[PDB]
Write a protein that binds this ligand. Structure first.
Ligand SMILES: *[C@@H]1O[C@H](CO)[C@@H](O[C@@H]2O[C@H](CO)[C@@H](O[C@@H]3O[C@H](CO)[C@@H](O)[C@H](O[C@H]4O[C@H](CO)[C@@H](O)[C@H](O)[C@@H]4O)[C@@H]3O)[C@H](O)[C@H]2NC(C)=O)[C@H](O)[C@H]1NC(C)=O
Ligand SMILES: *[C@@H]1O[C@H](CO)[C@@H](O[C@@H]2O[C@H](CO)[C@@H](O)[C@H](O)[C@H]2NC(C)=O)[C@H](O)[C@H]1NC(C)=O
Length: 436
């Protein structure tokens, strides 16, 4: 895709901190950029639509290559069009703004380069306000093994780059992306039956995904998802797997992950409104990526979680599922959890924590987003899922929401002023971001 010119692009600033020891942090002057797939796609010459609703113009885009030559990703009016604002260390994402729904943003090192985090033997902390996230919404903060440059050095017809939010990938091998690897996705494009603004093409973009935080005011989950190739790779057709292919398990990435959602793990009193972590008020989320020998070059062995609210440091609760022990993500936990819930162990099939850690070694990009779910209504996060199962069976109940909740047309109509706010990002050695 070309770099658009109809609307100017300026990346909202966002500070964050690097910490060297507890209480000892310094400030980085970061910025964020909107993902390419939210942008208007305009023909380079006339400023008319290359893509309208969910179909492509056949003169500008007769095939994938020609489309990428003829079409540009426009700049973004962050506040006015997308409901994205920042101030200091805080980033606020609004849900509905005009015809726009949600957003996905990446943290930048500079105007052409995503900030790469090396998570092994490190800790990442952030503050969040989920108080205005109801059933069906997901304020997600997570890492994916994207290329720092957004693909530009590999794909000459990607002239837009990280400056325009190119290069996304995740463990669903998303095929909804209009441009992947310097090519459009018009060949094979199929408009979404239930979304006027989206579709699915033949190409998908796969990479490992560390879902630090997927949450609303009802439930949260922390979930690593390994892929056979850790970094970004293109797939084609239904062999992509992931949510929107015919068979979600047909591909090279684990679409389910090894998840810890305290409600799903049998403690419903831990997280939610007025609960031990009270989602009506902001709180701090700390995540540690421990290695087997405690060094930077060890193998990822354990992912731990702490929360801080009203200055109280609160560990993740223990699993209360028979067969599944502890409060952290380890190989033993993951094997046991899949067995207890009767879920296919795709995590182990795609290399588990060893392959997740290999992706961490490659370096990962920080994503902050807000979305609703046109496949499964976020029921997997906050309801009883699958909806036909007995909610008392282990693994089924994930939150309090009814199974008819989270339909996009309902939540976009009823909760347009919902938002998520992320703030006070801190990153450094284990124990450096909080009072351990
Ligand atoms: C859902 O998960 C939460 C979070 O883990 C869990 O709450 C925790 O419950 C335990 C048990 O009630 C609490 O631990 C006790 O806390 C009190 C007060 O601080 C202490 O006096 C206790 O100390 C004694 O017992 C310890 C062993 O448990 C001994 O090591 C010690 O020497 C003392 O004899 C004890 O630590 C804990 O404080 C809460 N945590 C929070 C943050 O509220 C809850 O039980 C889970 N709910 C369900 C339904 O499963
Ligand atoms: C990070 O801090 C934690 C908590 O203080 C350290 O773990 C404690 O370590 C001692 C052993 O040295 C144990 O007796 C405690 O039970 C641990 N507590 C918990 C909650 O795990 C940990 O060692 C520190 N990590 C590093 C690398 O310094």
């Amino acid at each position: 895709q070309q770099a658009g010119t109809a609307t100017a692009e300026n990346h909202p600033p966002l500070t964050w901190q690097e910490c060297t020891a507890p209480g000892s942090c310094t400030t980085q002057n970061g910025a964020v950029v909107l993902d390419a797939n939210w942008r208007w796609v305009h023909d380079v010459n006339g400023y008319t639509n290359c893509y309208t609703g969910n179909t492509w113009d056949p003169t500008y885009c007769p095939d994938d290559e020609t489309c990428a030559q003829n079409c540009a990703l426009d700049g973004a009016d962050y506040e006015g069009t997308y409901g994205v604002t920042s101030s200091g260390s805080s980033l606020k994402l609004n849900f509905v703004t005009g015809s726009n729904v949600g957003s996905r943003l990446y943290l930048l090192q500079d105007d052409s380069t995503y900030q790469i985090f090396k998570l092994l033997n490190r800790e990442f902390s952030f503050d969040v306000d989920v108080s205005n996230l109801p059933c069906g919404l997901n304020g997600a903060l997570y890492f994916v093994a994207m290329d720092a440059d957004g693909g530009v050095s590999k794909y000459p017809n990607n002239k837009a780059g990280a400056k325009y939010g190119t290069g996304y990938c995740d463990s669903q091998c998303p095929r909804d992306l209009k441009f992947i690897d310097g090519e459009a996705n018009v060949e094979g494009w199929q408009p979404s039956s239930n979304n006027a603004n989206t579709g699915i093409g033949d190409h998908g973009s796969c990479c490992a995904e560390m879902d630090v935080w997927e949450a609303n005011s009802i439930s949260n989950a922390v979930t690593p998802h390994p892929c056979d190739t850790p970094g970004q790779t293109m797939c084609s057709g239904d062999d992509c797997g992931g949510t929107y292919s015919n068979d979600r398990y047909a591909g090279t990435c684990d679409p389910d992950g090894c998840d810890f959602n305290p409600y799903r793990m049998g403690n419903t009193s831990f997280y939610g409104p007025g609960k031990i972590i009270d989602t009506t008020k902001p709180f701090t989320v700390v995540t540690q990526f421990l290695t087997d020998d405690g060094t930077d070059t060890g193998t990822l062995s354990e992912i731990k979680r702490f929360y801080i609210q009203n200055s109280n440091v609160i560990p993740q609760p223990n699993s209360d599922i028979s067969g599944v022990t502890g409060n952290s993500i380890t190989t033993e936990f993951c094997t046991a959890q899949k067995q207890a819930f009767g879920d296919t162990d795709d995590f182990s099939q795609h290399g588990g924590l060893a392959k997740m850690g290999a992706a961490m070694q490659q370096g990962m990009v920080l994503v902050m987003s807000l979305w609703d779910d046109y496949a499964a209504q976020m029921l997997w996060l906050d309801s009883d899922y699958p909806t036909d199962a007995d909610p008392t069976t282990p693994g089924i109940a994930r939150g309090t929401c009814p199974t008819d909740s989270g339909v996009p047309s309902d939540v976009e109509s009823q909760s347009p002023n919902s938002y998520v706010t992320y703030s006070n990002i801190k990153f450094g050695p284990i124990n450096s971001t909080f009072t351990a």
